[PDB]
Amino acid sequence: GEAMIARPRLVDLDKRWGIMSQEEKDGLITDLYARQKQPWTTLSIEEKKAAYWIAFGEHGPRAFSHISQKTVFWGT
Amino acid sequence: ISYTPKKVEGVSFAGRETPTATGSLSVVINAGSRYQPDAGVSHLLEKFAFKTTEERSALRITRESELLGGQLSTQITREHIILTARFLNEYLEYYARLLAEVVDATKFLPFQLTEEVLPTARIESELFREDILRVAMAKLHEKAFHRGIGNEVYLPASASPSISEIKDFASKAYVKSNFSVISSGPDVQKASDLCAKYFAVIPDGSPLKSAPTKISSGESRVYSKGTNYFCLGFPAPAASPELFVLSSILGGDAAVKWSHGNTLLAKAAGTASEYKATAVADLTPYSDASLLSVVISGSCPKAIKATASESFKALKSLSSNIPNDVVKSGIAMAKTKYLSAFEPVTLNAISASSLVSASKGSDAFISGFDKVTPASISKVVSSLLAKPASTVAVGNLDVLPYYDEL
Amino acid sequence: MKPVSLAKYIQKSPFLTKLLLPISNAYVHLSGYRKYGLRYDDLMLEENDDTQKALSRLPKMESYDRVYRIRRAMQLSIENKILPKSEWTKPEEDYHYLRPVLAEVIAERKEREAFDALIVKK
Amino acid sequence: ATTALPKTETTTLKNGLTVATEHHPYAQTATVLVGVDAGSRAETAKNNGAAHFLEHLAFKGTKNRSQKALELEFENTGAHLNAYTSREQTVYYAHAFKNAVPNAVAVLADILTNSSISASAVERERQVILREQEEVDKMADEVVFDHLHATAYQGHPLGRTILGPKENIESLTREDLLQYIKDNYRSDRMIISSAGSISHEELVKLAEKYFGHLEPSAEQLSLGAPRGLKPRFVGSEIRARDDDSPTANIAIAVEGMSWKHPDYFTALVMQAIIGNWDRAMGASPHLSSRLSTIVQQHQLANSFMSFSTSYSDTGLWGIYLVTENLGRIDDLVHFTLQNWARLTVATRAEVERAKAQLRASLLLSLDSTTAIAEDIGRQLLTTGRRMSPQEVDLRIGQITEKDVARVASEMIWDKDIAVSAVGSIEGLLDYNRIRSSISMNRW
Ligand SMILES: [Zn+2]
């Protein structure tokens, strides 16, 4: 992983992530894993955003359900 | 990029492979205005396409096509009748079946003719008649070629063929030996198999017979108050690369968006009328004829006359000694202009004309561009200016010139 | 809504038709629309869209003949009299000439109505 | 063989330029596009209309090559050049024979990197700009849509014409154009795409050879991000009455949706539901849209089309009617708005038909190298990426009738509308009577 990853590949990740198939997910994870080897100064802001969203994001395990409290109040 | 003809089960085929998700299927039929028995028969016969067949009504056809997500389009030209169908690649079998059913069995109900077919043809005829340039080019064709391709295409305002004439013309025109099937989807073998399977029960008739084209000349004058027009027409035999290179040499438009150009016609207009009358040249190749036309358009009649005179002088001087660089640039432009007409899926004059004649087609026709010499172009030009040309004038007739005063 | 008739279920069984032929003969004689020189299909109501469209798809000869027959019948009805027994509508000429066109129009309308209401049952 | 569907490669350079090429193996023509994310919206009230002036310019020779030498470069090699300016982006493209692409790319890079904007050129082009502005006015559709834009987003820079006022055109100077070029032509907001014979590696090499000097912008913003404040929809009407015209062009629109809005394809599906019509259509009677049925049955109008023009943070969603049956315009408008409002109880079959039609139409349009290049450029300039057909199919398929009903009740139900009329529009009623048809009282 030496060449910079194209911006149109790491833009609006949250909307696309659910629809995006498994193979693209593994490819992106592997590419970012190979990328983070270099010193982080040379990296762009969007790469950092994508990396953080991949690691400490909302998808995957920590995707909890949200309950509308107003609905509970009105039902009561 | 090139159609490779075959013949399966006695059916003409022309396949093409492209990396796209959408295919097509067109049936080019030799039933144009050249072969019509009376005025307006071909147009009405074309309009009857995709009407009530022997298996499904027109409403069912339209609703099924709408549900499947496809576009059904027809096209009438001076020497063909074309029925197309663009679709996603899933419904290729269904669309082939529909086209085969439409061509083979299509009952002609007189009330359908009196209800839907006739008003649509009349509306199209009025829409064509409203335009001025198309009428001028049609009159140029009428004056150039006496009959055959010199016949009017669209329905005249004072004609109304009976249903029996259309029915018998369709009976003696829709036969296996008088059309071809053209497909340009992402697969050719499957399309060929389906076309051979479904376009197989149509009877083995006989090809329609027409006389060789007869070439003459004449001038027509009409009056108008708006933009003035003046057209020159040089009839010629079947198209050759020399004619294409000559047409690209004449040019007329601009290579870049906002400029005047540097071809012969642009220089003539600039030197004559200070770019107050645009001159444009074009070529229309037919099966056994071609028409190289020059169109001079503008608002000032005097500028039109001066531009016409200067353009004719330049065309006459083009036969003396053509510099090599001019021929090189003309060939370079003509290659691109000819090749660009094959990308669109819908057929035009160039692609249909190439596909009709299997002797050359497009495989060797393009290869012959790079073997054109200034002597060949000079010979072609000198042969064109032997017989008199033909003119059509629209606008104030007191200033627009006749052919004897160019 | 529309005229109704059990004119096919009886045709299914030949015995019923053979039994009911004389009664139908007597009834048609008693109706007396043939005494005015008319045909049965002339009397059918024409005020909806279907029959109005159908009447515009007849051959011109049929329309002209129907117009003349109706006008002559009304002229006779003016003076309360009938034609002599020679100029009565013979059975051979009293055929159904409007029903097929109306059937075609109704079939077209029913096909459009069917397409109108659809559903997706996965 | 079955072949395949080529994929759109994407590569970026050090500066930030993005390259996206679709390569056809067997082809003889190629198209190259270079787009800039700066339309006429970035112009202020003083220097309005500079983008169109730049578009007309920048073809008059750079410092290295003068005019009448650039054209000879684009004629003796068999090429074409073109450019058009929208309200948010500018596009330059040039397609030629497969063996004359690198020279055209080099010429385009020379044109965009530096130009010799001279006072004499501006003085010469002033008159041609004035003539273009005068000649554009004749067309009815352009005037109707310009008036609709002006009356919808009034006050905002998005509500001005692209060409600009006459005073703006005549008073423009060299410094304004130079400043616009300096502060809006940055490598972060540029793009270069292709579709045809050329390959990805060749175009990347060409871009590195030539487009390697464009300095990035001061702020590191994204592509297609909103700039300025969100415009406010202001429902109003404009009546440019003229009794000489034998027709009556009318356009009605409501608040639209942006590129990134999470219901975009639902709005597209609704537009497909409404559909288009024309009296010259071969199968006009048999179309399966109720509005077409009524209009054709009663001969109410000549034709009508539906549009869903969208922008960075707003958009429009309406219809465009042309008619000559004067005196029955009110019935046409009433039935159009009734069919609009009915969409809150839409049935499954209509939604399925609209989905199929939209899926077919989104792919049947691309049939040439120029069209594919334009589509790729626009998708990259407005969104940031080009959606593969799999993603588009998945997004469209998820849409159901309940989503359509929700969106219609949210935006199509009783709400402010924007009207624009040109011609013999006397038969058109007031604003309140027009608006009253947007909601049905029998529910
Ligand atoms: Zn302009």
DSSP B33-56: TTS-SSTTHHHHHHHTTTS--SSS
- Let me know how long chain A is: 76
Q: Which residues of D touch C118 (CB under 8 A)?
A: 347, 349
Contact of D310 with D325, CB cutoff 8 Å: no
Nearest 10 degrees: Cα torsion D111, D113, D119, D121: 10
The encoded tokens of residue B76 equal 């009438």
Q: Which string of DSSP letters, residue by residue, matches A2-53? A: -SPPPGGGSSSHHHHHHHS-HHHHHHHHHHHHHHTTS-GGGS-HHHHHHHHH
For chain B, give the number of residues. 406
State the DSSP H helix or E strand holding residue C88, giving kind and residue range, or none if neither.
none
- In DSSP terms, B291 is beta-bridged to B235, B284
Inter-chain CB proximity C118 and D349 less than 8 Å: yes
The verdict on a CB contact (< 8 Å) between B111 and C57 is yes
User: Do the annotations mark residue D52 as ligand-binding?
Assistant: yes
How many angstroms separate the CA atoms of D51 and D187, rounded? Answer: 18
Close Cβ partners of C111 (under 8 Å, ≥ 6 residues apart): B57, B59, B60
Residues D28 and D201 sit within 8 Å (Cβ to Cβ)? no
Instruction: Supply the DSSP symbol for B398.
Output: T
C-beta separation of D328 from D426 below 8 A: no
**Alpha carbon of residue B218 to chain centroid:** 22
How many alpha carbons lie under 13 Å from residue D328 in its C-beta half-sphere? 12
Handedness of CA B152, B155, B157, B162 (dihedral sign): positive
* D72: closest chain B residue by CA: B262
Question: Is-contact B25 B184, C-beta < 8 A?
Answer: no
**Residues of D in Cβ contact (< 8 Å) with A16:** 391
Contacts of B318 (CB under 8 A, 6+ apart): B249, B264, B377, B378, B381
Show the DSSP H helices in chain C as ranges. Answer: 9-12, 14-31, 49-55, 60-79, 99-116
Q: What are phi and psi of B76, to 5 degrees?
A: -115, 130
Please provide the distance, in angstroms rounded to a whole number, between the alpha carbons at the two ends of chain A.
57
Distance of alpha carbon D133 from alpha carbon D169, whole angstroms: 10
CA B11 to chain centre: 24
What count of other Cβ atoms lies within 10 Å of the Cβ of residue C10? 15
Q: Are D317 and D257 in contact (CB under 8 A)?
A: yes
Contact list in D for residue A47 (CB cut-off 8 A) is: none
With beta carbons under 8 A apart, name residues in chain C contacting D352: 120
What lies within 8 Å, CB to CB, of D103 at 6+ separation is D73, D77, D79
CA gap C55, C66 in Å, rounded:
11
CA D296 – CA D329 distance, rounded (Å): 14
Task: Tell me whether chains C and A touch (3+ CB pairs under 8 A).
Answer: no
| Token pair belonging to D24 | 């056809």
Q: Find where tokens 């011109």 sit.
A: C60
What radius of gyration do chain A's Cα atoms show? 17
Q: Which of D2, D29, D280 sits opposite B340 (nearest CB)?
A: D29
Cα–Cα distance measured from residue B374 to residue B328, given in angstroms and rounded to the nearest whole number: 10
D124: left (phi over 0), alpha (psi -120 to 50) or beta: alpha
CA geometry: angle B93, B98, B100, nearest 5 deg? 95
Q: Cα separation of D298 and D332, whole Å? A: 10
CA distance D319 to D271: 9
Residue B391 DSSP SS3: strand
Q: Which residues of D touch C (CB under 8 A)?
A: 288, 347-349, 352
Cα distances (Å, whole numbers) of residue B322 to B308, B314, B378, D272: 21, 12, 7, 56
Neighbours of A64 (CB within 10 A): 7
User: Which tokens hold the place of A31?
Assistant: 């590419």
With contact defined as beta carbons under 8 Å apart, do B203 and B37 qualify?
A: no
CA-wise closest residue to D304 among D358, D357, D250: D250
Rounded to an integer, what distance in angstroms lies between the CA atom of residue B100 and that of residue B83? 11
Looking up tokens 């400029």, which residue turns up?
B259
Q: Is B148 left (phi over 0), alpha (psi -120 to 50) or beta?
A: left
Task: Report helix, strand or coil for C84.
Answer: coil
- Running DSSP on this structure, what letter comes out for residue A9? G
B-contacting chains (≥3 CB pairs under 8 Å): C, D
Shortest CA distance from C101: residue in chain B: B111
Cα B57-B58-B63 angle, rounded to 5 deg: 100
The verdict on whether residue D132 carries a ligand-binding annotation is yes
C63 Ramachandran zone, left/alpha/beta (phi>0; psi -120 to 50): alpha
Alpha carbon distance C32, B184 (integer Å)? 69
Beta bridge partners of B296: B230, B279
In this structure, the number of other CB atoms found within 10 A of the CB of residue B388 comes to 13
DSSP B72: E
What is d(CA B64, CA B57) in angstroms, rounded to the nearest whole number? 11
Are A13 and A20 in contact by the 8 Å Cβ rule? The answer is: no
Q: What share of chain B is helix, strand, coil (3-state, %, to 5)?
A: 40, 20, 40
D208 among annotated binding-site residues = no
Q: Is B147 helix (H, G, I), strand (E, B) or coil?
A: coil
Read off the amino acid at residue C108. Answer: E
DSSP state of B394: E
- For residue D124, list its beta bridge partners: none
Angle at D64 between CA D63 and CA D65, to 5 degrees: 100
Query: Strand B26-29 vs strand B81-88: parallel, antiparallel, or unpaired?
Result: antiparallel
The amino acid sitting at D281 is M
CA D129 to ligand 1 center in whole angstroms: 6
Phi, psi (5° rounding) for residue D116?
-100, 75
In single-letter form, the type of residue at position B215 comes to I
B370 neighbourhood in chain D, CB within 8 Å: none
Phi/psi of residue C11, each to 5°?
-65, -25
State the amino acid at position D257 in one-letter form.
Answer: M
- Confirm if D322 and D249 have CB atoms less than 8 A apart: yes
Q: Check: CB of residue D102 under 8 Å from CB of residue D201.
A: no
User: What's the full length of chain D, in residues?
Assistant: 443
Closest listed residue to residue B44, CA positions, set B136, B95, B117, B104? B117
- The CB density around residue D240, as the number of other CB atoms within 10 Å, is 13
Tokens of residue B333, six digits: 């432009």
CA distance D93 to B71: 30
Sequence letter at residue D396: I
**Tokens, residue B224:** 């108008």
Residue with tokens 């041609």: D128
d(CA D270, CA D350): 10
Q: Do chains A and B touch (3 or more CB pairs under 8 A)?
A: no
Say yes or no for a CB contact (<8 Å) between A7 and D16. Answer: yes
* Residue (of D290, D297, D300) closest to D343 by Cα position: D290
- Going D151 to D152 to D157 to D162, the CA torsion angle's sign is negative
**Contact criterion met (CB below 8 Å) for C41 and C101:** no
C114 in reach of chain D (CB within 8 A): no
DSSP characters over B170-233: HHTT-SGGGEEEE--SS-SHHHHHHHHHHTTSS--------PPP-B----EEE--SSSEEEEEE
Residue found under tokens 């042969």: B383
Q: Confirm whether D170 is a catalytic residue.
A: no
Burial C12-40 (b: 16+ CB within 10 A, else e): eeeeeeeeeeeeeeeeeeeeeebbbbbbb
**Beta strand B390-394 pairing with D18-23:** unpaired
Q: How far is CA D339 from CA B26, D291, D298, D332, in A?
A: 36, 7, 16, 11
Q: Does an H or E element contain B73, and which?
A: strand B71-76
Would you tell me how many other CB atoms lie within 10 Å of the CB of residue C109?
13
* Distances from the Cα of B107 to the Cα of B83, B111, B114, B118, B167, angstroms: 17, 12, 15, 16, 9
- Indicate yes or no: CB of C108 within 8 angstroms of CB of B57: yes
What tokens does D222 get?
Answer: 């994204």
Q: Active-site residue among D55, D73, D125, D352?
A: D55
Nearest CA among B288, B154, B271 for reference residue B215 = B288
Helix, strand or coil, per DSSP, at residue B279: strand
CA atoms within 13 A on the CB side of D286: 21
Query: Which residues lie across from D82 on neighbouring strands?
Result: D93
Question: Helix, strand, or coil here: B81?
Answer: strand
- What's the gap in Å between the CA of B61 and the closest CA on chain D? 9
Q: Count of CB atoms within 10 A of residue B145's CB?
A: 23
Test D282 with B22 for CB contact under 8 angstroms. Answer: no
DSSP one-letter code for B115: I
Side-chain half-sphere of B59: how many Cα atoms within 13 Å?
A: 17
Q: Are residues C115 and B59, on separate chains, in Cβ contact within 8 Å?
A: yes
The shortest CB-CB distance from A8 to any of D14, D20, D262 is to: D20
D100–B contact, CB cutoff 8 A: yes
Beta strand pairing status for B26-29 and B4-8? unpaired
Three-state SS string over chain D comes to CCCCCCCCEEEECCCCCEEEEEECCCCCEEEEEEEECCCCCCCCCCCCCHHHHHHHCCCCECCCCECCCHHHHHHCCCECCEEEECCCCEEEEEEEECCCHHHHHHHHHHHHHCCCCCHHHHHHHHHHHHHHHHHHCCCHHHHHHHHHHHHHCCCCHHHCCCCCCHHHHHHCCHHHHHHHHHHHCCHHHEEEEEEECCCHHHHHHHHHHHCCCCCCCCCCCCCCCCCCCCCCCCCCCCEEECCCCCCEEEEEEEECCCCCCCCHHHHHHHHHHHCCEECCCCCCCCCCCHHHHHHHHHCCCCEEEEECCECCCCEEEEEEEEECCCCCHHHHHHHHHHHHHHHHHCCHHHHHHHHHHHHHHHHHCCCCHHHHHHHHHHHHHHCCCCCCHHHHHHHHHHCCHHHHHHHHHHHHCCCCCEEEEEECCCCCCCHHHHHHHHCCCCC
Q: In chain B, what is the straight-line distance between the N-terminal and C-terminal CA atoms, in Å?
A: 43
Residues D358, D287 contacting (CB under 8 angstroms): no
The rounded Å distance from CA B14 to ligand 1 centre is: 43
Which residues precede a break in chain C, with C-to-N distance above 2.5 Å? Answer: none
Residue linked to tokens 């202009």: B337
**b/e D256-289 (16+ beta carbons within 10 angstroms → b):** bbbbbeebbbbbbbbbbbbbbbeeebbbbebbbb
Instruction: Give strand pairing partners of B285.
Output: B290
Q: Could you tell me whether strands D18-23 and B277-285 are parallel, antiparallel, or unpaired per DSSP bridges?
A: unpaired
- List the chains bordering chain C where 3 or more Cβ pairs fall under 8 Å: B, D
Task: Compute CA distances D242 → B212, D145, D236, D248, D328, whole Å.
Answer: 54, 17, 20, 9, 18
CA–CA separation, B325 and B262 (whole Å)? 13
Of B373, B370, B327, B334, give the one whose Cα is nearest residue B350: B334
Using DSSP, state whether C75 is helix, strand or coil: helix
Secondary structure percentages of chain A, helix, strand, coil, to 5 = 60, 0, 40
Place of tokens 């396949």: B15
Residue D255, token pair as written in the block: 């608040």
CA nearest neighbour of D152 among D227, D243, D87: D87
Mutate one of D8, D24, D28 to test the B interface: name it (highest B CB count within 10 A). Answer: D28
Structure tokens, D181: 């070029």
Q: What does R_g of chain D's alpha carbons equal in angstroms?
A: 24
How far, in Å, are B189, D38, D379 from residue D55 at the CA level? 48, 12, 21
CA D75/CA D70 separation, integer angstroms: 9
Residues from chain D that touch B264, judged by Cβ atoms under 8 A, are none
Looking up tokens 């139409």 gives D361
D128 CA to centre of ligand 1 in angstroms: 8
